[PDB]
Symmetry: C4
Subunit: 95 residues, 4 copies
């Protein structure tokens, strides 16, 4: 279960690095903005303060969403159930 978490963590980082490199390069964003945009996209928040302007970028974004959402939300689920929940329970019992 901690190996579950480690693998999803690594896969999430790799997915976000991919988006960061793509949007910096093709859409001209600063790397920090490309990372922020990738996260805002795959978590489905979608502020729209950044959005792709090129057709290459729009096509990549379609594929990136379909491939990336399942992973990101898998990681969020495991983070909440396997890390946050036990730490919350631990705080309820003094030692």
């Amino acid at each position: 279960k901690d190996k579950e978490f480690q693998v999803l963590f690594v896969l999430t980082i790799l997915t976000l690095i991919s988006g960061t490199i793509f949007y910096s390069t093709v859409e001209g964003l600063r790397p920090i903005d490309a990372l922020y945009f990738s996260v805002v996209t795959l978590t489905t928040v979608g502020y729209g303060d950044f959005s792709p302007q090129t057709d290459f970028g729009k096509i990549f974004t379609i594929l990136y969403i379909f491939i990336g959402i399942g992973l990101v939300f898998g990681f969020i689920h495991k983070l909440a159930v396997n890390v946050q929940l036990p730490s919350i329970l631990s705080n309820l019992v003094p030692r």
Copy 2:
């Protein structure tokens, strides 16, 4: 399970084609933008760089969301569990 995936894949493509034809025609978008907008809508990202301006478009979008979200997210779930997950597991074991 591969037939599960094939059917949801075909249904997702048909749903996206419907949106592409509607928004190109009624809202005047380029076909690639109409496809991109349909995906950004049904995955609930919603950047808002495109949004419907006509009342016909707003009404269609209401119905398209309610009909389309369940399918799209069904496909994403099956993609992640039935395709991405086994390929990830396969990479962990050399042959």
Copy 3:
């Protein structure tokens, strides 16, 4: 299961009517725009082509989201599993 669906359908309509009346009145939107905005909000798409400008509207929106998401997505789930899925299966078998 059809009574499950009927009840969630009615509750979803009532929830959307509430939002339509509120945003038309307090935020000055046309009724069709208030309905469209309510749907775009509770399905979490959030284009931002409309958003509340008054403090009353921002406060209402906070509460409306927390109360409304669970219902709307309950209805979407039942629509997809109890209505769309059987109709899709029915199309695969000629009579």
Copy 4:
């Protein structure tokens, strides 16, 4: 189950207070706008009428989303199943 709900309720309030203090301070928002923005972010609506403009804010938002979504949606789930659903069932049976 009512203690389940109480704990998630308190944790949700604390999470929203954190965001309210951060975005008011670093991004200069009025407290009510910072609260509204925090809710619009963690429920994944993401209108984009507010969005972070500083790099500190963008970095915080990335972490806030990953930590906050699992909690918020846990609370929404329990609200809908453990509070809204029984009250709806209660209305169907006069006394």
